[PDB]
Amino acid sequence: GMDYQEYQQFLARINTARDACVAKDIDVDLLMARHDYFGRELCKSLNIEYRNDVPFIDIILDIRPEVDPLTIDAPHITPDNYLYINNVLYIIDYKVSVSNESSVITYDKYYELTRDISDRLSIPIEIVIIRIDPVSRDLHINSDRFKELYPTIVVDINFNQFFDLKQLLYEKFGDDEEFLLKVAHGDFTLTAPWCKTGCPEFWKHPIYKEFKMSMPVPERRLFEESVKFNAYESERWNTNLVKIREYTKKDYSEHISKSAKNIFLASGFYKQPNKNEISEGWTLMVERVQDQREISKSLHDQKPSIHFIWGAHNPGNSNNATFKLILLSKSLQSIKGISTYTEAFKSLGKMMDIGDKAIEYEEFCMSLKSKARSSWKQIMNKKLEPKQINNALVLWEQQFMINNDLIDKSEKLKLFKNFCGIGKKQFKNKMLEDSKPKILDFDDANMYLASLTMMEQSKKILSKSNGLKPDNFILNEFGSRIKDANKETYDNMHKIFETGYWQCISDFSTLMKNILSVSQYNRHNTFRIAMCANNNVFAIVFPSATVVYSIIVLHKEEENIFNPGCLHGTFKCMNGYISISRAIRLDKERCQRIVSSPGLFLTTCLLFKHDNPTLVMSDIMNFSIYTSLSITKSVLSLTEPARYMIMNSLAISSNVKDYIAEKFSPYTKTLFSVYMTRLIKNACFDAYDQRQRVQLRDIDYDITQKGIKDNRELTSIWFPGSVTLKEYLTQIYLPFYFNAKGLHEKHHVMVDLAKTILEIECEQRENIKEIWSTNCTKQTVNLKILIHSLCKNLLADTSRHNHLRNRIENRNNFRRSITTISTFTSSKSCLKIGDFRKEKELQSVKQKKILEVQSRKMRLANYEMLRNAMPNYTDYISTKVFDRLYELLDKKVLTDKPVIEQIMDMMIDHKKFYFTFFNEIFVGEYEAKMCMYAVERIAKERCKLNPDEMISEPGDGKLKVLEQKSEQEIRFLVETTRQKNREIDEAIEALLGKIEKLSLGKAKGLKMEINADMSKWSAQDVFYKYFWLIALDPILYPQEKERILYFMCNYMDKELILPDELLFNLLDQKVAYQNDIIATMTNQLNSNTVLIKRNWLQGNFNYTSSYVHSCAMSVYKEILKEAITLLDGSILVNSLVHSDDNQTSITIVQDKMENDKIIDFAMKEFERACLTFGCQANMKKTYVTNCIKEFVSLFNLYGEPFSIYGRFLLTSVGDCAYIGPYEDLASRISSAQTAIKHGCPPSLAWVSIAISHWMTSLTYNMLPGQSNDPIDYFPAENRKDIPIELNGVLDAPLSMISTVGLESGNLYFLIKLLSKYTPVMQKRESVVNQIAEVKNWKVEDLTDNEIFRLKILRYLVLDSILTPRKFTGSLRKLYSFSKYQDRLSSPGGMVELFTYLLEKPELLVTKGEDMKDYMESVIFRYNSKRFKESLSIQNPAQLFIEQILFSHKPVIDFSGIRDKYINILGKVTFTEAYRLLMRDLSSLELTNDDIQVIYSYIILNDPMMITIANTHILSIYGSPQRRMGMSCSTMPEFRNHHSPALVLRAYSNNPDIPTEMARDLVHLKEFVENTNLEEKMKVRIAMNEAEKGQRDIVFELKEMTRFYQVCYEYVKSTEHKIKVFILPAKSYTTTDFCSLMQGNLIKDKEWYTVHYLKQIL
RNA sequence: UUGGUAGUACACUACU
RNA sequence: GCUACCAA
Structure with a gap:
């Protein structure tokens, strides 16, 4: 082959090399040697003279000696060789490359530069590139004319020696990162392998063998060939991809064409909504429901539509607590007549009859309170003895003993067993496996009329004036700003606050707050009494998570009450009537929502009413009070499907019939539910009848006006009136967000989830056999199409970033220690398997002991078993992520080597995987989490490159993309239709029988929006398809691929663990063989595990699955395009993908076919596109329009963005952790902030902000006139002037609140001071200048309020403050906690650790890259009181009520606050804290220097606060103007190192x-x-x-x-987050964003332009 | 840790 | 579950 001396020299250099520099040079020399070697052998075959490089002037001097080298101006190129024959100059160049790319550039360069000289000398110059593929050894020559001179070229040439040398060089420097950088060139760069060896076990894995045998023989070879491929050692990185792409190109292209030709087979009759479809669907729905339910036509089977009866107040009587107590006692005893429970009721009144000894009652009560309030903790070891007060046995204020002297045992029993339902079961059952849930007949005539009269009655009563002052917190403290935002909403508030609706719901809220407060310490042999500001309504809290209660209403006329279907009986008493509600057993989380309901109701009503004069507020309120208070599964079964039913009904293409038939499953237990089911039914029919008004006709300015200039012509759904499209959509989508979380029980959500999982798995085991198919067989993939599409997408996506593998490593911290990665050190749950029999069996025993003790303490009248019955029980416990990391580190299973290296190891080491449900809906092992991290983050980064994949899109990016795509599409439709008809339009407008002929032949536009949903995304996917995604990946080394694929093989053998909860219930009633799927799939409860093969578990492979989804839509695009060029039309296809969410947009212009056939064609190929890639598009939910885009609950209407911002406003009432006044308020406010960027109008934002304050204050009894109300304890004549940190009211412009939240309260105050106290001459200066002028301020001139504020800012705010501490851990399951306990007990242990941390203070805030650093920082955490509390799950209802009940106890550690400004035993009450605070400040003065320190830490330290400050000072407003055409703008960075x-x-x-x-x-x-x-x-x-x-x-x-x-x-630099605001115009800078925000959030009806007088940032 | 004895504590309170 | 006392 090559020269031998030369060869041995290369072999010496390689052996000697120690540098990437030296090694790089060798690489270049090998390439240059290989190139020369080819040329020499090439020239020998052509029998011409070999020349390495030749100047172009020499070529000329040779073929034209008479030419003047000084005047010719030859190009500056140096061809390898040439050949002048027959007056044609052939320029030659040799290439050794498997690609034609080098050749193209060389040709284009040479050709272009030889044009001038060709024309001058009259010499044709032919550019000849002679390339040889060093793999195949085939020659490639472009020049047709040169091949005529050499039609037979033979080059017996061998490159084997160069391959061996390159391979030896690359093996030696394979780990050298620098080598890979230099060698790599220049669109593809790798990094060092993550592991040295691969995984031989993979090739023997039965699941791989299954995957193998299932493919044709060629695809087997190609897969094994693709796994062993590695881009580093290969000629090019893309050879494997290109090879496999080309092999599959024939079958691919045939699929595209065969599918595209289907356009001509479209009948045009696609699935489509109409009267009959809805009717027939409904018919089939009723049939299904009857099989699954027990339908009743009887009203007495009715359930409470609301858990509440109500009556108006009595101004004739007193509103004193003690008065009311007696009044109720007497009213109960004076019940007339005989009925099943009247004797018990009278007895109850006797047991709370304190007679006239009110003064004795009060002082006894205040005595007990004072004692309880004396301690931060609960009073211990002092028995509570009930005091005799007249007939009453009083244990506490409004707590009364159940006195058996004052009630017959026979009557007492009826009260508990039958009325309260405590301890009763009627198993009228015939077989071992035979009792369906009972509901009302929603489609019965009279049953409906029954519901209608309830709604009618409630309107007649609640619409009436409440006869009270409308004044309340919201109105008094925010009415001013709400009015200035929009007077209409202000007026609407009053309308509500004047009615019985508002009073009723406000009473229910206050009473429920009190019911809960009272239930906390209620005992098994006592009842309690709740009251409210309404001196006619009460609640009896019956003896015992849950509360059992009955409402009691005193009223003059007997039918003058609000009875929403939960009256038990109205009774005549002494001085009028007394009504009692059914006993209500309601879990405390629902109860907490009831307390919040006035916020929901107000929010809902003002929202539905907003800006619509056609709507009757009365009608709104009647509907809203039920949706706000009917906290039930009944309503839940209605509001969800309503979206799909109604939307399908008005869609171009959809399937109402099937959705209603199969999935709509009303649970109409209440009358309101029956009433609502009807509203939904009519909505569908009404929706279809106005379908044409929603869907656009044949139409730039005609399209956009529809959405922007939205006129009110649609029919309202929930109440009479007309409605705009936007308002229409809100009515459809908002109700789903009324729903509460956890309306289902603990046991019942698990069981349903377990059964579906198991059922799907069982179906597959017995019916799903095939993996691949070409006819879209259920749950299969089209093999060759998958492969080809993957190669193409892997090529395109990898090409648009050359340092991809590096990106993955850096962004996901592959190279860094596992202990430095948030998700691997979190407080999330995690699963570990082992032997915990003794621990659990001891707990089983200890748990039963505490059970019987408390069960024995009664003045009233099992794990071990499980594991004896289950031979194959896989034992486990759920711990925390960080805890499991500690353990594995401690046992040296894990280390602090780079995380990716350990992941690789783990993929070989962890062979058996386990998952289970929660105590991302599945919990996995820590080991499972490591493996999937590598796979999903690889996918994640390539998803970001893929332009259609959106689950990878950061922040609010989606809403902006939708807009950009839709504005791109309106443009295309318009311009494309205008250009196709430019000539027809000209012939027409030039000139009625001949105009008509021309106007038919013109092209028609078709716009269709597919708002799609995928079915059983994760549960019925073809997991095997991802094997190729891994094997084909060029950035992965063979060793890495082998391990990854071995993991994925093991993953298909994973097991789901059934919680013991599910297994007890079945063993409990297992007399013999049972057919429950849970027992069936566990070999009759032999195991607690089930193998879950094909179902990859929801949440685990989102990116990976979403990437293939994108690939499926790329095939879809190609099919639609080919289909339309067969019509010579134009088309624009856009596709947005997000796991199981898909929005695909098609814009077509053609003149050969009716649109109905194109629609029919387009949908079938959409369905087929999904199926060929193993996805099942859900056509019950998937619907098509030509104007409305829906994607992940984001909308675009005729180009304009739209969001149901209401959902965020509703959540701004309940979302907080209940820590303190400031934190809770901060948490609630952020929802209003979210709504604002989602398009919430100014006035409604304030209502949200108002409600947020109310709920927060309500939680700590800080409302006006309440105990912890701080107004009197501070120098302030208004809530706005008292700091926000002391639960003052927030005061700031809404634009400022939106951007920086609560911190605006102070920022604005400081801005008011600059406007007041800087010299007259400096007022028009920027912020920085006005702050410098503070040195010329006079503290003596400041008001008391102003100094009070400043003092607080200076000594307290710098580095929330009034936060209650609780006495509270139960951390037995945490390995690391047990170690923390060993160190506590160790003699010098803790001090040693405190010492170690002071030496390495880095660990106090962060966690080091070192293992020891991490392990020691964790042990340290446990020393923190607040950390240990976080590890235990807390019921938010219990957090809420605990905060209420401890409001008067001493819970402020003032010593923790006070010490910070110096140069008292224990805790303190809120009210005492105020007082101590003022006292300290009085003796702690404020200098000019102090004020400067304030401004410098708050304003000048933050570029954002500087900017925002300047925007408010320097701004001036332009005249008002309407809002027309809103636009999405991203919030710009304001702020301007290493780990x-x-x-x-x-x-x-x-x-x-x-x-x-x-x-x-x-x-x-x-x-x-x-x-x-x-x-x-x-x-x-x-x-x-x-x-x-x-x-x-x-x-x-x-x-x-x-x-x-x-x-x-x-x-630490904050990575700029993407957050998108809907605005009146577009923001191009930081200046634009501020001006628009500042100008958009002042008035509802209009917005203002905001300009500035000076520079800002 | 086991066994025994005795306990287990608090809001609303309002133009109504 | 927590607390006080007692016994091992």
């Missing part, structure tokens, strides 16, 4: 442990010494210990922590 963890270590002073580390460190030190800190805490430490006379290791830790936490939040 914070290491940077902080360097600080404690060696940038070593590059130079840039010092660069970081230098300006970290500047931040320190300017606002001195290093010297501040050193002094602060020295003081504390000198006072104590001994070292205080705790205080030193606290100080250090905050010192370094300040540094941690200074160093």
Whole structure:
């Protein structure tokens, strides 16, 4: 082959090389040698003279000696060789390449540059590129004329020696990162392998053998060939892809064409909504429902539409608590007549009859309260003895003993067993496996009329004036701003607040708050009494998670009550009537929503009514009060399907028939549900009849006006009136968001989920046999089409970023320690398998002991078993992520080597996988999490490159993309139709019988929007298809592929673990063989596991699956395009993909076919496209329009963006962790912020903000006149002037609130001061200038309020403040906690660890890359009280009520607050904290320097706060204008290093442990010494210990922590988040965004232009 | 840890 | 579950 001396030299250089530099040079020399070697052998075959390089002037001098080299101006190119024959100049170049790319550039360059000289000399110059493929050895020559001179070229040439040399060089430097960078060139770069060896076990894996045998022989070879391929060692990175693509090209192209030709087979009759479709669907629905339910036509089977009866108040009587107590007692005893429970009721009134001894009652109660309020903790070891007060046995305020002297045992029993339903079961069952749930007959005539009268009656009663002042918190504290935003909404509030509706719901809320408060400490042998501001309504809280209660209403006329279907009986008493509701057993989470309901109801009504004069508020309220309060499964079964039913009904193409027939399953237990089912039914019919008004006709300015200039011509759904399209959509989609979470029980959501999973698995085992098919067989993939489409997409996507593998590694921290990755160190749940029999069986015993004790303590009248019955029980426990990492680190299973390297190892080591449900809906092992991390993050990055894949799109990016696509599509439709008819239009407008002939022949536009949904995405996918996605991937090495595929093989052998909960119930009633799917699939409860093969579990492979989804839509695009060119038309196809969400947009212009046939064609190919890739498009849900896009609950209407922003407003009432006034309010406010960027109008945002305040204050009894109300305790004559940190009212422009939330409260206050106290001459200056002028301020001139505020800002805010502490862990399952306990018990353990952390203070804020660092930082965490509390799951209802009940107890650690400004035993009450705060401030004065420090930490430290400050000062507003055409704009960056963890270590002073580390460190030190800190805490430490006379290791830790936490939040750069705002115009800069925001959020009806007087940022 | 004895604590309170 | 006392 090559020269031998030359060969041995290369072999010496390779052996000697120690540098990427040296090795790189060898690579170049090998290539250049190989190129020369070819040329020499090539020239020998052509029998011409060999020349390595030849100047072009020499070519001329040779063929034209008479030409003047000084005047010819020859090009500056150097061809390898040439040949002048027959007056034709052949320019030659040799290439050794498997690709033609080098040749194209060489040709284009040479050809272009030889044109000038060709024309001058009259010499034809032919450019000849002679290439040889070094693999096949085939020659390729472009020049047809050169092949005529050499029609037979033979080059017996062998490149084997060059391949061996290259291979030896590359093997030696394979791990050299620098080598890969230099060698790689230049559209593809790799990194070092993640592992050395592959996985031989893969090739023997039965599941691989299954995957193999299922393919034809060629595809087997190609798969094994593709796995063993690696781009690093190959000529090009894409050879494998290209090879496999070309092999499958024939069958692919035939599929595209065969499918495209189907356009001519379309009948044009596609699935389509109409009267009959709806009717027949409904018919089939009723049939199915009857099989599955027990239908009743009887009203007495009715369930409560609302868990509440109500009556108006009585101004004739007193509203004193004690008065009301007696009033009820007497009213109960004076019940007249005989009925089943009247004797018990009278007895109850007797048991709370304190007679006239009210003063005794009060003082007894206040005595008990004072005691309880004396302690932060609960009172212990002091028995509560009931006091005798008249006939009543009083245990506590409004708690009464169940006195057996005052009630017959026979009557008492009826009350519990039958009325309360406590301890009763009627098993009228015939076989072992025979009792269906009962519902009302929604389609019965009279049953409907029954529901209608309830709605009618409730309107007659609640519409009436409540006869109260409308005044309330929302109105008094936010009415002003709401009115200025929009007077209409202000008026609408009053309309509501004046009615019985508002009072009724407000009463239910207050009473429920009190019911819950009261239920907490209620005992098994006591009842309790709840009251509210309405002196006619009460609640009896019956003895015992849940509350059992009955509402009691006092009223004058007997039928004058609001009875939403839960009245038990109305009774005549002494001075009128008394009504009692059925006993209600309601879980406390529902109860908490009831408390919140006034917010929901107000929000709902104002929303539905907003800006619509056709709607009657009365009608709105009657509907809204039920949706707000009917917190039931009944309504849930209606609001979900309503979206699909109604939308399908008005769609171009859809399937109402099937959706209603199969999936609509009403649970009409209440009358309201029956009433609502009807509204939905009519909605569908009404929807179809106005279908043509929604869907656009044949139409640029005619299209956009429809959505922008939205006129009100559609029929309203839930109440009489007319409605715009937007408003129409809100009525359809909003109701789903009324629904509460967890309306289903614990046991019942699991069981349903378990059964579906198991059923699907069982179906597959017995029917699903095939993996591949060409006819879209159920749950199959078209093999060759998958392969070809993957190659094509893998090529296109990989080409648009050359450093992809690097991107993956860096963005997902593959190279870094596992201990530095959030998701691998989280507090999420995780699963581990092992032997925990003893632990659990001991707990089984200990649990039953505590059960019987409490069960024995009654003045009233099993794991071990499981594991004896189950031979194959896979034992397990659920721990936390960080805890499992600790354990594995501790047992040296894991290490702190790069995470990706351990993942690779884990893919071989973990052979058996397990998953289960929660205590991402599946919990997996930590090991499972590691493996899938690699696969999904690889996919993640390539999804980001793929332009159609959107699950990878960061932030709010989707809403902006939808808009860009739809504005691109309106353009295409318009311009394309205008250009196709330019000539027809000209002939027409030039000139009625001959105009008509021409107007038919013109092209018609077709726009269709496919809003699609995929079916059983994860449960019925063809998981095998992803094997190719891995094998074909060029960025993966063979060793990496082998391990990944071995994992995926194992993954298809994974097992689901059935929670013991499911297994008990079945064993409990297992007398013999049973057919329940759970027992069936467990070999009759032999195992607690089931093998789950084909179902990859929901949430685990989203990116991977979403990438293939994109591939399926790329085939779809090609089919539609080919189909339309057969009609010589134009087409634009766009597709947006998001796991099981798909929005595909088609725009067509053609003149040979009716649109109905194109629609019919397009949908069938959509269905087929999904199926060929193993996806099942769901046509019950999938619907088609020509104007409305829907994608992941985002809309685009005729080009304009649209969102159901209401859903965020409804969640702004319940979302908080219940920690404190400031935190809770912050949490609730962020929902209003979200709604704003989603298009919420100004006035409705304020209502949300108002409600948020109310709920927050309500939680801590801080409302006006309430105990913890701080107004009187501070220098302020208005809530707006009291700080936000002390639960003051928020005061700031809405534009500012939107951008920076609660922190705007202070920021605005500081801005008011600048506007007031800077000199008259400086007022028009920027912020920085006005802050400098603070040194010329007079503190003495400031008002008391202003100094109070400033003092708080200075000494408290710098580095939330009034946060209650709780006495509370139950952390037995945490491995790391047990170790923390070993260290507590160890003699010097903890001090040793505290010491270690002070030495490495980096660990106080971060977690080091080191293992030891991590393990020791975790043990440390446990020393924190608040951390340990986080690990235990907490019921939000219990968090809510605990906060209420402890409101008067001392829960403020003021000593923790006070110490921070110095240079008392235990806890304190809220109210006492206020007082202590004021006192301290009085003796702590405020200087001009202090005020500057305030401005510098708040304003000047944040570029955002500077900008926002300037925007408010320097702005001036232009005249108002309408809102027309809203646009999506991304929020720009305002703010302008290395890993914070290491940077902080360097600080404690060696940038070593590059130079840039010092660069970081230098300006970290500047931040320190300017606002001195290093010297501040050193002094602060020295003081504390000198006072104590001994070292205080705790205080030193606290100080250090905050010192370094300040540094941690200074160093770390925040990655700019993508958040998109709907605005009146487009924002192109930071200046635009502020002006628009500032100008868009002031008035509902109009918006303003905002200009500025000076520079801003 | 086991066994025994005795307990297990609090809001609304309102123009109505 | 938590608390106080007692016994091992």
